[PDB]
Design a protein around this ligand. Structure first.
Ligand SMILES: [Mg+2]
Ligand SMILES: [Mg+2]
Ligand SMILES: [Mg+2]
Ligand SMILES: [Mg+2]
Ligand SMILES: [Mg+2]
Ligand SMILES: [Mg+2]
Ligand SMILES: [Mg+2]
Ligand SMILES: [Mg+2]
Ligand SMILES: [Mg+2]
Ligand SMILES: [Mg+2]
Ligand SMILES: [Mg+2]
Ligand SMILES: [Mg+2]
Ligand SMILES: [Mg+2]
Ligand SMILES: [Mg+2]
Ligand SMILES: [Mg+2]
Ligand SMILES: [Mg+2]
Ligand SMILES: [Mg+2]
Ligand SMILES: [Mg+2]
Ligand SMILES: [Mg+2]
Ligand SMILES: [Mg+2]
Ligand SMILES: [Mg+2]
Ligand SMILES: [Mg+2]
Ligand SMILES: [Mg+2]
Ligand SMILES: [Mg+2]
Ligand SMILES: [Mg+2]
Ligand SMILES: [Mg+2]
Ligand SMILES: [Mg+2]
Ligand SMILES: [Mg+2]
Ligand SMILES: [Mg+2]
Lengths: 140, 59, 166
RNA sequence: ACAAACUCCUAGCCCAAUACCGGACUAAUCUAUUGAAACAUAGAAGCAAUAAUGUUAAUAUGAGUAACAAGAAGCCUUUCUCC
RNA sequence: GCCUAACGAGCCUGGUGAUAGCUGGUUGUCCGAGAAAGAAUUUUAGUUCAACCUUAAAAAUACCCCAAAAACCCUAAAUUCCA
RNA sequence: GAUUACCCCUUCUACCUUUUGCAUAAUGGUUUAACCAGAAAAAAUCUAACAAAGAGAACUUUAGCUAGAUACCCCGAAACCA
């Protein structure tokens, strides 16, 4: 009972589906296609991992620029926003930086205020005064 | 805040000429900020693939 | 073998509704198994494209290549069928729409070398295809002006978005 | 401050790998019954090629590249020019 | 040297799927677990045993481990062995 | 990866074989199609029959017997003999 593979056409089609937009001979010849397609998928999955650090880099830059406009550097801005107990994404923060410049300058004013409060608190060398923005709320 | 679409587009991506006076400055510290402004890295709309970046005139 | 091109003359259309644009005559013609090579034939085919049939005949006539006499006869045949078998008023009204060469079937032979080595020598044949259309030759495209470029560039600066930003 | 496969967070089908060794499924044939257009339970096998300076057929590239040939004029076989 | 364009021993057909501890190849998907050299050997390009390991099974203790304990002249980091 | 946008940006040392280690400047392949390489049932495990017995003859039996199912490639010398 001799058997041959009749459906070889669709087997090839399934790997050429992905190969159509490649340059040169990879979009035709089944060898070249197979290899370039495996390459393509591997870089696909690595890109999934990268694109999270890329987007986060982008965000940090935009936050840095927005912060620079108001004369405050990136680390200062972020730390002080945190020490005020305001937890905001860098995604949400960069979006505020572009599409709501007013609110964002409000934030930068807040952070700057909180920081000067910090310098004054630590240089003052006494334990008593709580700057109005230095109090810490425990939730109920 | 309410602009037509084409003018909003134009206003956002406008190229802005900067002047920077040089006399008695370390050329490195000069090139630091000159480069930042050149590249568009002061604009919160910045992206690598956008053409955005501004002229810089050093005198 | 595949014969298709020849059959493109066998299409019969539905009659004309009143006052529409008159669809200009298309004539197809080919010549199969010419003794010329495909690659040389290509240059002749490339030369006469878009020309009015009279200019094409003029060019071909004085050209040196042995393909010239061939493509010439083919254009004359095409013209004769254009006026006779189809109906075309004003036989100089034709221009060349599409001109092209395909490879025909090839002959195989031995080519002796030296020290008793042989190469495999392929006798070359090719087909010549031409499509003629009745009407004055289409206008040749003018090189982009500065007023064009500046328009592209602005249209691009103005197509930007703030990316990843919403 | 910025920085990982580490660790949180929101959902899950819930944690790497060469030699060797376990499992679960399935492509394409044929044969039993079904199935009727692509079939589903079994039983069977010449049972699945991106790699053997693989075999045959056909196509490219090198490449229109290397290399090949017909002494002159006329009235068309008649003179010339040479070996 | 030569014995029909390969002669330290012709060519052909058999023996012949000669025999290669030596190269070179060996085709679907997805999951479990996963290895580094102690012996002998015409042995060191290889095999066959042990040890580790994989797949099933039966069980009871396994690593860690405080005193206590293991040499006689001098002798460090540390081992062995156990609740 | 993406982008309004093909590029332009940013991130990535062809593939097999072979090795302690190969982007290697180690081997292999122009490309397409068709062909082109894992076979055995002693012992074992798994599923059933009947059981002090079991097998459609000869055998084996201190839970055994009988049946099924699970297994071990392809191409290459120089040679030697008629
Ligand atoms: Mg058959
Ligand atoms: Mg993750
Ligand atoms: Mg050829
Ligand atoms: Mg991080
Ligand atoms: Mg694993
Ligand atoms: Mg097979
Ligand atoms: Mg194939
Ligand atoms: Mg070679
Ligand atoms: Mg091959
Ligand atoms: Mg060629
Ligand atoms: Mg050349
Ligand atoms: Mg030459
Ligand atoms: Mg001559
Ligand atoms: Mg001889
Ligand atoms: Mg062998
Ligand atoms: Mg011995
Ligand atoms: Mg050996
Ligand atoms: Mg113990
Ligand atoms: Mg490396
Ligand atoms: Mg190889
Ligand atoms: Mg080595
Ligand atoms: Mg090297
Ligand atoms: Mg080499
Ligand atoms: Mg080698
Ligand atoms: Mg090679
Ligand atoms: Mg047995
Ligand atoms: Mg039993
Ligand atoms: Mg002997
Ligand atoms: Mg011998």
């Amino acid at each position: 009972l001799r058997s041959r593979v009749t459906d070889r056409y669709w087997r090839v089609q399934e790997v050429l589906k992905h190969a159509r937009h490649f340059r040169g001979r990879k979009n035709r010849c089944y060898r070249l296609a197979v290899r370039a397609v495996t390459r393509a998928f591997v870089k696909c999955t690595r890109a999934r991992r990268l694109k999270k650090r890329s987007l986060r880099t982008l965000w940090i830059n935009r936050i840095t620029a927005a912060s620079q406009e108001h004369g405050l550097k990136y680390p200062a801005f972020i730390i002080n926003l945190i020490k005020c107990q305001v937890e905001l994404n860098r995604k949400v923060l960069a979006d505020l930086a572009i599409y709501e410049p007013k609110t964002f300058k409000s934030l930068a004013a807040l952070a700057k205020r909180r920081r000067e409060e910090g310098f004054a608190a630590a240089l003052g060398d006494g334990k008593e005064p709580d700057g109005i923005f230095s109090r810490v709320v425990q939730h109920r | 805040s309410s602009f037509s679409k084409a003018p909003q587009q134009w206003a956002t991506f406008a190229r802005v000429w900067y002047l920077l006076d040089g006399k008695m400055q370390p050329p490195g510290k000069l090139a630091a900020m000159a480069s930042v402004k050149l590249q568009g890295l002061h604009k919160p709309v910045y992206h690598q693939l956008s053409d955005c970046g501004d002229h810089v005139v050093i005198m | 073998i595949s014969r298709k091109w020849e059959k493109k003359n066998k299409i019969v259309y539905p009659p004309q509704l009143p006052g529409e644009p008159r669809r200009p005559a298309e004539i197809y013609h080919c010549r199969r198994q010419i003794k010329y090579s495909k690659d040389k034939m290509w240059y002749l085919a490339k030369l006469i494209r878009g020309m009015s049939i009279d200019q094409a005949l003029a060019q071909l006539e004085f050209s040196d290549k042995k393909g010239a006499q061939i493509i010439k006869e083919v254009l004359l045949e095409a013209q004769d069928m254009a006026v006779r078998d189809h109906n075309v008023e004003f036989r100089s009204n034709l221009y060349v729409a599409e001109s092209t060469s395909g490879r025909g079937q090839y002959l195989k032979r031995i080519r002796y070398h030296g020290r008793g080595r042989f190469g495999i020598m392929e006798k070359v044949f090719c087909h010549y295809f031409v499509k003629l259309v009745e009407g004055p030759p289409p206008p040749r495209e003018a090189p982009k002006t500065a007023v064009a470029h500046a328009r592209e560039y602005i249209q691009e600066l103005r197509n930007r978005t703030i990316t990843h930003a919403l």
